[PDB]
């Protein structure tokens, strides 16, 4: 840790482009400006030292955490002053969650449509109300002081960033101490947080929620301070511990947990009152998660001769096919920030996809399962975040290979031998992509052709040539013969999706078994195909970022270059950046098909209403099994049918969704101008417009230049992603607010 | 069924025996000894014995 | 093959010859500039057409020009 | 002096553009806080 | 011409056709393009995304016209 | 001809020679390294450069020049020779053809494809109709 | 009515922009400030490489190719 | 009356949609006065106030007064932009002056836009608006 590395001053605020060398000679052309924002967070190009790069990264992470805390505090303030949270808590099913009361200036007040309870605002789909009920928050003053705490935490991260960059900045070995870091982040950052939230679940969340789950009508609960001050409130709630400040923790210290089994439960399933998870199960969950994470943060050698060096583990792990195995990966992963960013972005994208696929099927918060808006929104949001982060992990893998790969570090290790048979890897992935594309999409268009022919017996359907997903069905079977079988000490299954019975909260289905048929088989192989092609593009970018048979010196050209000219037949889009650019479209395709499958299968075979007698009437009435096998059925019974809500929205509270549906169509189509053209036309057109300006003594001193080839691709893919995702967003939200 | 994990002398006997077994393991496994068998080795052995005993007690009075 | 011509605006900065990935250009004596050297293209049969030489040229307009013509195995950059 | 280097940052194109746009947004929005729905000059 | 004399370019293909630039050196030797004219507007010259250009070039005496002395 | 040099410690790869090396043409680069070093092959991966003479067969002239520029030249090895090998066995020296590198002006070199005019002074294709004449014709 | 007025101006837009692309390609087919020798490279060529800022879609054929989208849209 | 149009006072459909006027602003009345003001316009079959763009000084407020207002405002904007670009072109730090706006010079330009047309006419009289055709870069042909 140093003392005063950087003088805190406003001098360099006045100088755009101080951080680079090409960016401080004055902007002679327009491109400089774009390059400024293109080069701002490339700390590797600013200076050429790991220490300054790491200090920059540390205090940038501080600023990002400050921004996220500002966001958190904004959410809590809007829920504490501009929402209907207490009214929603009074009547969960009858009240939809809403916040963000728009200002009534030009039309917009129609978007404050009645959500219920007299409150007038935009219906929220983020599931924040459910989060606040699940955490044990009852009134809004708790959320208000949580907003205050979020603002003060944001101020703390802001000051910590200024402090750890400008005042006391760490040295390299502090950053390179991956041992102390991993021990602090398995145990100290994850385990402590899990334990403290269990300390919020043992004492606050479970009491408040158990009282709410009987009809106590909110307000008459004591405040959460009274539940540790008075164990007399803990008397009637699970009596079977002495419940004292010394006596109550004695059963933990004496291996006496059958007493704790009343609130540390392993029930599983769903609460048949709220449609959420059993919060006793989540408390026991966080307890076990905390303990396993604190155990896990005790395996790395820091200062006391106990623990593993990651290096001994890595360089030891090696086999007869992999040469020297992992010899050299330790140097790679403590020298390249990009090699770590690749893994961490890919892993967090996979976690976000997992979070999407988990919070729909074991709905973990009270009254979010029967809030189909919230459920659809949360799944689709986490799927998009996961796809974007995965493509970013591929991007920084390519960046690592271009900039931070050293052949002397990597000799006959797994990195080197992967590079030495990239051609076999890419050719086999190419073959898998073609096979999957044929035997999924060709199946779909075969079905379209036979349905048009009037040959339904010749289709790949449940009434024609059956393709039953037998493996997924048997895994579904083994999860329901397991809340009494292979998981004996457990009340209900992991989720009702694998089997069980219709969990019916209010008049609505919370979760029912999702049976898997031929249409599911087809759309799962479509998902596998789209994932494999995205993998093919991104892995080909990562493995060929350095060289190929076409360009043997791509590492000298860099990570972000347009081409190597029209020769060799034409070498457009050879860079790793352009492979990320193509993988972004293919991620869009994959995630779009995934969320379309989710929306249709949920609306067709799970969601709906439950009659007083007990008959489920699904929203689209089970058209999935016969219409999701053709492209015509997807076009008609999913896209054409369910878009009626977003296009009939003009004149109601859903009006903004129709407006954004159209605006997103516009932005997506605006993207194609950047995607299909090239900058030469635009430079020649800017030339004549420059003539028009030069005639009137008005041509600017900063020369107007068209965007670069890479910037043209970047703008096109950004507008394409923005428009397509926002189209699907507006469609989804309008449809599921109206029918859900 | 929710087992009979309660305060027994046998629970403490198992905990002490597991602590002794972890001390023996540390006297047979742990590579770095110049650190601190010093306090760091002793605390490590004690915590490992505690974890193994927490497993063993649950397994015994869950059987 | 591709045709790489050099025009007498060449200043002899040598940057096109150093930018060539396929050893097409060289510098030969010439009294027409201060530097005393002009680029030459004696090996256009090994030209791939990448136009790195034109990217390297500082003169306005370029003193080196690549005209992409007939395509062969060498000019298509084929390792097979 | 640092407030002269703040005068320079609060004179850049992104800052001046954003400030003037916020100003003109205020001019229009607080004109529809008053006389509304003006498709035409009433004459 | 001479150093410091503003000259208008008459080369068709030059980026600064019908534009004025200052001479920095006239070569005394008998080369084809001895006039070294520097400009304020930079070239297109550079790779894609390069925030720079070329503001000087070599012209013959028949391709420049002395505007001022 | 009869190119001499030890093969570097290269574990083999799928990015090396194909059928064109055996039926059409291949290339070699020879160089002399003063010590055992590590370098990156153009066909991906790390190889170990021997002391003395190294001989490497590649599929393209561009790969040989990429190895010579990005690997040999930063390691101060400027003695390399690039040969084109024909499938019968005939080799021709290619890159240091006269011994001096092409970026250094050598007396003994003649000007090829030099056009004694500017780019703007070229003829117009309309005048240059039916004929073998091209606008860049000398 | 007003719908016809607004669509007629959409058509005027479409005609003017398709004409703009085609005319800009025709009148810069001989050459521009980005490439003042475009006569010698012909009508259809890919580009002049990533040099001089980048020259994708610079040929006059490329203006046809870009105006075909606008003609289809109009 | 122009092109078969009826005035909005004498249009049944106008009053039919006036009976259910949605409140645009925070005013309790809002749409009431909206339809009352829109009554003066020339409505149609649909009962929406179609605007006529013909000069037609009786129906002048629908285009001509907004046309003049836009022209004056945007001419102010264009002239002050031209003035600033011309007055930074003298100083050699113009490239710095374009991304870092010389604010006092900007206000000095901005306060003069109220006299934008007459001054511009003067340039049209003198020759200080149009640069010559042999002083501007052109591409070859
Ligand atoms: C106390 C005030 C203060 C002052 C006077 C400075 C001054 C300086 N800092 Mg510093 N810094 C500060 C606080 C301050 N900092 C804080 C609180 C942090 C933690 C986040 C940092 C972290 C930091 C790093 C890593 C670096 C500096 C650097 C610098 C120097 C370069 C100036 C520059 O161009 O960047 C000014 C940039 C801005 C003014 C933009 C700020 C961007 C904010 C943080 C985010 C905005 C996004 C926001 C969410 C809105 C999104 C927009 C969207 C909604 C449209 C300069 C002397 C750099 C340096 O030393 O040169 C190489 C550098 O490496 N600072
Ligand atoms: C147990 C101690 C401890 C804790 C709690 C943390 C926590 C954190 N570290 Mg850290 N670190 C530690 C020890 C610790 N570290 C040690 C010993 C080293 C040196 C090897 C480092 C080196 C390090 C680096 C290089 C980075 C971090 C980063 C982070 C943040 C990750 C962002 C996040 O997950 O969102 C969760 C947000 C919260 C949990 C709220 C934070 C509130 C405070 C800070 C937590 C503690 C409160 C306190 C106990 C009272 C996180 C807050 C990353 C970062 O984002 O920069 C800040 C990052 O780049 N750490
Ligand atoms: C961050 C973790 C955390 C924190 C700060 C606390 C804090 C507290 N607990 Mg708790 N507890 C925890 C985790 C935690 N617990 C876990 C993981 C379990 C399950 C094994 C329990 C089971 C428990 C019981 C049964 C009791 C407490 C009680 C208490 C209070 C008594 C003070 C004391 O024991 O010393 C105290 C405020 C006592 C209390 O006051 O009841 C509310 C009480 O009897 N705790
Ligand atoms: C942990 C997350 C993370 C971090 C720290 C980085 C960090 C970095 N990335 Mg990166 N990346 C990520 C995730 C991340 N990335 C993801 C998830 C993707 C997939 C899209 C990418 C793909 C990517 C590419 C292709 C490149 C980088 C590059 C870089 C480097 C410089 C970036 C820069 O200049 O800032 C500049 C940021 C901008 C100019 C923002 C542009 C506008 C964004 C893209 C759209 C925002 C739209 C908004 C969300 C909604 C619309 C708002 C609008 C209507 C107003 C830097 C080291 C660059 C590099 O050269 O590496 C060395 C590089 O070219 N990244
Ligand atoms: C004394 C011998 C013994 C016996 C009879 C058991 C018995 C049992 N253990 Mg256990 N365990 C032991 C030693 C033992 N353990 C040791 C030494 C450790 C390492 C600390 C563990 C760590 C462990 C874990 C992590 C888990 C079990 C669990 C279980 C239960 C179910 C295991 C299963 O798959 O079926 C079962 C009753 C499960 C359980 O129910 O938790 C207590 C389970 O999750 N054990
Ligand atoms: C470019 C085409 C265009 C034109 C000609 C108009 C014209 C108009 N719009 Mg519209 N609008 C447009 C595009 C356009 N808009 C777009 C792209 C959107 C989407 C964001 C909107 C969304 C919109 C809304 C929500 C509203 C309007 C309104 C209006 C009217 C009142 C303007 C006003 O404030 O009073 C005059 C303003 C001044 C005189 C300001 C100058 C003051 C200085 C001091 C002089 C006006 C006739 C309002 C209306 O009432 O409709 C009839 C209204 O509610 N517009
Ligand atoms: C000083 C500012 C200024 C002025 C006087 C002009 C003037 C002109 N432009 Mg230009 N333009 C500008 C800025 C300016 N432009 C900027 C910033 C861009 C990049 C977006 C353009 C892009 C552009 C194109 C593509 C075209 C013109 C054309 C024209 C001519 C026709 C009128 C027109 O199109 O209106 C409309 C102008 C726009 C839509 C540009 C946006 C308006 C900008 C933002 C105004 C600039 C304000 C300035 C930044 C503030 C300075 C004030 C100072 C105190 C700080 C006209 C002489 C056309 C032409 O060639 O005529 C034959 C044409 O094809 N312009
Ligand atoms: C997979 C089983 C497996 O790992 O095979 C065995 C082999 C790795 O075996 P090794 O024991 O040599 O590798 C172990 C070390 O890398 C781990 O320390 O994998 C391959 O060679 C590539 C597999 C082809 C990939 C096809 C897809
Ligand atoms: C749904 C949302 C859409 C997702 C879009 C994902 C785009 C994927 C491309 C990666 C971009 C990130 C890496 C940049 C690196 C990159 O690849 O950029 C490429 C391009 C220029 O890069 P060049 O290849 O020309 O670089 C050459 C230089 O390095 C010098 O040789 O930069 C731009 O496109 C302009 C971007 C800034 C435009 C002006 C900034 C205006 C405001 C920006 C802030 C908006 C709000 C942000 C969120 C709050
Ligand atoms: C949500 C949020 C927030 C809030 C936060 C908070 C307020 C929280 C917290 C927190 C806390 C408040 C935490 C805590 C904790 C704790 C823990 C984690 C613990 C521990 C422990 C220990 C260390 C123990 C130990 C022991 C043992 C085991 C042995 C002996 C005995 C004893 C018991 C001592 C804010 C505002 C930022 C913003 C928005 C978001
Ligand atoms: C349209 C298009 C352009 C032209 C795009 C440009 C010139 C982007 C710049 C447009 C905006 C409008 C620049 C705005 C400039 C100023 C910031 C405007 C002042 C705004 C104030 C009012 C704030 C390319 O350069 C290009 C390059 C490569 C492939 C495809 C394309 C492509 O499709
Ligand atoms: S079209 Fe564009 S990207 Fe492709 S080779 Fe030509 S200049 Fe490069």
């Amino acid at each position: 840790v140093d003392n005063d590395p950087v003088p805190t001053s406003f001098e360099k605020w006045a100088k755009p482009g101080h951080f680079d060398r090409t960016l401080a000679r004055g902007p002679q052309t327009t491109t400089w400006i774009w390059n400024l924002h293109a080069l701002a967070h490339d700390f590797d190009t600013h200076t050429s030292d790991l220490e300054d790069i790491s200090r920059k990264i540390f205090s940038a992470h501080f600023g990002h955490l400050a921004v996220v805390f500002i966001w958190l505090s904004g959410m809590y303030f809007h829920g504490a002053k501009f929402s209907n949270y207490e009214a929603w808590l009074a009547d969960p099913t009858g009240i939809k969650p809403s916040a963000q009361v728009v200002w009534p200036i030009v039309g917009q007040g129609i978007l404050n449509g009645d959500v219920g309870g007299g409150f007038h605002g935009i219906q929220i789909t983020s599931g924040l109300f459910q989060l606040w009920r699940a955490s044990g928050i009852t009134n809004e003053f708790q959320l208000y002081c949580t907003a205050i705490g979020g603002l003060v935490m944001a101020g703390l991260m802001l000051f910590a960033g200024w402090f750890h960059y400008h005042k006391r900045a760490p040295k390299l070995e502090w950053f390179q101490n991956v041992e102390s870091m991993l021990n602090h982040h398995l145990a100290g950052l994850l385990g402590l947080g899990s334990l403290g939230w269990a300390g919020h679940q043992i004492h606050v969340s479970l009491p408040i929620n158990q009282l709410l789950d009987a009809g106590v009508a909110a307000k008459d609960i004591p405040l959460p301070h009274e539940f540790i001050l008075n164990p007399s409130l803990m008397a009637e709630l699970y009596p079977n511990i002495n419940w004292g400040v010394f006596s109550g923790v004695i059963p933990f210290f004496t291996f006496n947990w059958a007493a704790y089994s009343d609130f540390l439960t392993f029930k599983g399933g769903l609460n048949p009152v709220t449609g959420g998870l059993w919060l006793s199960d989540t408390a026991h969950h966080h307890v076990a998660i905390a303990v396993l994470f604190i155990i896990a943060g005790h395996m790395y050698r820091t200062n006391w001769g106990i623990g593993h060096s990651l290096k001994e583990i890595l360089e030891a792990h090696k086999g007869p096919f992999t040469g020297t195995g992992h010899k050299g990966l330790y140097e790679v992963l403590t020298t390249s920030w990009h090699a770590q960013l690749a893994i961490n972005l890919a892993m967090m994208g996979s976690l976000s996809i997992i979070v999407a696929q988990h919070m729909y099927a074991m709905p973990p918060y009270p009254y979010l399962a029967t809030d189909y808006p919230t459920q659809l929104s949360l799944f689709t949001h986490h799927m998009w975040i996961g796809g974007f982060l995965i493509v970013g992990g591929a991007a920084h893998g390519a960046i690592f290979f271009v900039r931070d790969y050293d052949p002397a570090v990597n000799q006959n290790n797994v990195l080197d031998r992967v590079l030495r048979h990239r051609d076999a890897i890419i050719s086999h992935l190419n073959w898998v992509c073609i096979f999957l594309g044929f035997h999924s999409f060709g199946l779909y268009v075969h079905n379209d052709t036979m349905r048009a022919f009037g040959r339904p017996q010749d289709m790949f359907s449940d009434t024609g040539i059956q393709l039953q997903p037998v493996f997924a069905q048997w895994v579904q079977h083994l999860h329901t013969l397991a809340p009494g079988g292979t998981a004996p000490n457990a009340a209900a299954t992991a989720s009702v999706a694998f089997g069980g019975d219709v969990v019916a909260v209010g008049g609505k289905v919370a979760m029912m078994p999702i049976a898997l048929g031929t249409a599911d088989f087809l759309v799962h192989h479509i998902h596998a195909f789209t994932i494999h092609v995205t993998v093919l593009i991104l892995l080909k970018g990562v493995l060929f970022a350095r060289s190929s048979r076409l360009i043997p010196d791509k590492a000298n050209l860099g990570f972000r270059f347009p081409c190597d000219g029209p020769g060799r037949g034409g070498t457009c889009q050879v860079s790793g950046w352009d492979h990320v650019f193509l993988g972004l479209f293919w991620m869009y395709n994959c995630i779009s098909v995934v969320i379309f499958h989710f929306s249709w299968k949920m609306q067709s075979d799970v969601w709906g209403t439950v009659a007083p007698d007990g008959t489920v009437s699904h929203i689209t009435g089970g058209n999935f099994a016969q219409s999701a096998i053709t492209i015509n059925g997807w076009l008609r019974d999913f896209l054409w049918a369910q878009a009626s809500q977003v296009i009939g929205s003009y004149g109601s509270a859903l009006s903004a969704y129709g407006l954004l549906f159209l605006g997103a169509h516009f932005v997506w189509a605006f993207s194609l101008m950047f995607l299909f053209s090239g900058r030469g036309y635009w430079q020649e057109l800017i030339e004549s417009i420059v003539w028009a300006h030069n005639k009137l003594k008005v041509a600017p001193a900063i020369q107007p230049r068209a965007l670069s080839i890479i910037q043209g691709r970047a703008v096109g893919v950004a507008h394409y992603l923005l428009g397509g995702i926002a189209t699907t967003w507006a469609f989804f939200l309008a449809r599921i607010i109206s029918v859900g | 069924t929710l087992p009979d994990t309660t305060w027994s002398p046998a629970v403490g006997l198992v905990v002490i025996l597991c602590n002794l077994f972890a001390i023996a393991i540390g006297r047979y496994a742990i590579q770095s000894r110049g650190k601190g068998f010093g306090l760091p080795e002793l605390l490590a052995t004690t915590s490992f014995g505690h974890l193994l005993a927490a497993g063993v007690v649950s397994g015994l009075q869950y059987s | 093959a591709h045709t790489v011509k050099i025009y007498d605006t060449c200043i002899g900065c040598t940057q096109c010859v150093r930018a060539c990935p396929t050893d097409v250009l060289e510098m030969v004596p010439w009294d027409g500039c201060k530097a005393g050297q002009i680029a030459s293209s004696p090996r256009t049969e090994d030209c791939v057409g990448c136009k790195r030489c034109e990217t390297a040229c500082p003169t306005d307009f370029l003193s080196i020009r690549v005209y992409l013509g007939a395509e062969t195995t060498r000019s298509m950059g084929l390792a097979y | 002096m640092q407030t002269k280097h703040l005068l320079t940052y609060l004179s850049t194109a992104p800052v001046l553009a954003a400030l003037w746009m916020t100003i003109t947004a205020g001019i229009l929005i607080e004109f529809n806080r008053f006389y509304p729905d003006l498709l035409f000059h009433p004459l | 011409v001479q150093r410091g004399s503003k000259v208008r370019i008459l080369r068709p293909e030059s980026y600064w056709y019908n534009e004025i630039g200052t001479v920095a050196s006239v070569d005394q030797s008998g080369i084809k393009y001895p006039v070294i004219v520097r400009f304020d507007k930079v070239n297109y010259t550079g790779f894609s995304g390069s925030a720079g250009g070329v503001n000087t070039n070599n012209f013959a005496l028949s391709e420049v016209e002395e505007v001022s002395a | 001809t009869t190119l001499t040099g030890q093969p570097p410690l290269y574990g083999g790869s799928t990015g090396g020679l194909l059928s064109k090396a055996d039926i059409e043409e291949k290339y070699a680069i020879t160089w002399t390294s003063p010590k055992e070093q590590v370098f990156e092959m153009p066909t991906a991966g790390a190889a170990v450069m021997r002391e003395g003479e190294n001989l490497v067969y590649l599929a393209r002239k561009e790969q040989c020049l990429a190895l010579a520029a990005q690997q040999l030249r930063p390691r101060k090895i400027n003695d390399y020779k690039i040969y084109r090998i024909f499938p019968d066995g005939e080799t021709v020296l290619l890159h240091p053809k006269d011994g001096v590198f092409p970026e250094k002006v050598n007396q003994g070199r003649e000007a090829v494809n030099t056009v004694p005019r500017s780019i703007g002074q070229n003829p117009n294709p309309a005048q240059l109709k039916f004929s073998g004449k091209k606008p860049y014709d000398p | 009515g007003p719908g016809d007025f607004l669509v007629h101006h959409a058509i005027a837009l479409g005609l003017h922009t398709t004409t703009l692309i085609l005319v800009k390609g025709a009148l810069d087919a001989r050459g521009s400030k980005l490439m003042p020798d475009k006569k010698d490279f012909g009508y259809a060529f890919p580009c002049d490489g990533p040099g001089r800022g980048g020259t994708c879609d610079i040929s006059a054929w490329d203006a046809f190719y870009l105006a075909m989208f606008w003609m289809l849209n109009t | 009356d122009v092109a078969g149009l009826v005035p909005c006072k004498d249009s049944p459909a106008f009053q039919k949609r006036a009976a259910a006027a949605v409140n645009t602003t925070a005013d309790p009345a809002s749409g009431q006065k909206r339809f009352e003001r829109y009554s003066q316009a020339l409505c149609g079959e649909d009962g929406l106030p179609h605007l006529v763009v013909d000069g037609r000084l009786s129906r002048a407020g629908d285009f001509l007064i907004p046309s003049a207002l836009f022209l004056f405002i945007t001419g102010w904007i264009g002239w002050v932009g031209r003035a600033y670009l011309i007055a930074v072109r003298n100083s050699g730090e113009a490239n710095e002056k374009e991304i870092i706006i010389d604010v006092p010079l900007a206000i000095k330009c901005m306060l003069t836009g109220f006299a934008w047309p007459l001054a511009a006419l003067k340039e049209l009289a003198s020759g200080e608006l149009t640069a010559k055709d042999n002083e501007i870069t052109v591409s070859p042909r």
Side-chain angles (χ1 to χ4, degrees), chain A residues 393-475:
Chain A
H396 292 276
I399 300 165
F400 156 75
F401 262 106
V402 157
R403 289 167 150 201
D404 296 350
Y405 168 83
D406 168 86
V409 161
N410 305 290
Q411 327 186 207
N412 221 30
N413 57 354
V414 286
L415 209 61
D416 191 66
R417 310 163 66 90
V418 150
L419 287 182
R420 292 198 274 113
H421 73 294
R422 54 187 192 171
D423 286 289
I425 298 173
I426 288 321
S427 66
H428 296 69
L429 195 35
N430 202 71
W431 173 79
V432 178
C433 290
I434 303 171
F435 171 82
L436 279 169
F438 277 135
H439 300 77
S440 55
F441 178 69
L443 298 197
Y444 271 81
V445 286
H446 164 104
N447 283 188
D448 276 275
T449 308
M450 311 265 125
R451 190 166 270 171
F453 275 154
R455 300 162 57 170
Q457 81 280 354
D458 284 333
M459 303 177 42
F460 290 106
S461 62
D462 277 336
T463 66
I465 298 153
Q466 280 204 146
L467 299 175
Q468 284 287 341
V470 303
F471 303 124
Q473 285 158 1
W474 308 163
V475 173

Side-chain angles (χ1 to χ4, degrees), chain A residues 22 31 33-35 37-39 388 559-562 577 584 708-712 714-715 717-719 721-723 725, chain E residues 48-51:
Chain A
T22 43
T31 321
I33 296 149
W34 305 118
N35 277 348
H37 312 86
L39 272 309
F388 267 105
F559 163 72
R560 201 183 32 230
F561 63 100
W577 190 99
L584 280 160
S708 42
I709 308 162
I710 297 289
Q711 181 168 10
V715 173
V717 69
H719 285 58
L721 288 164
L722 171 69
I725 288 157
Chain E
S48 201
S50 145

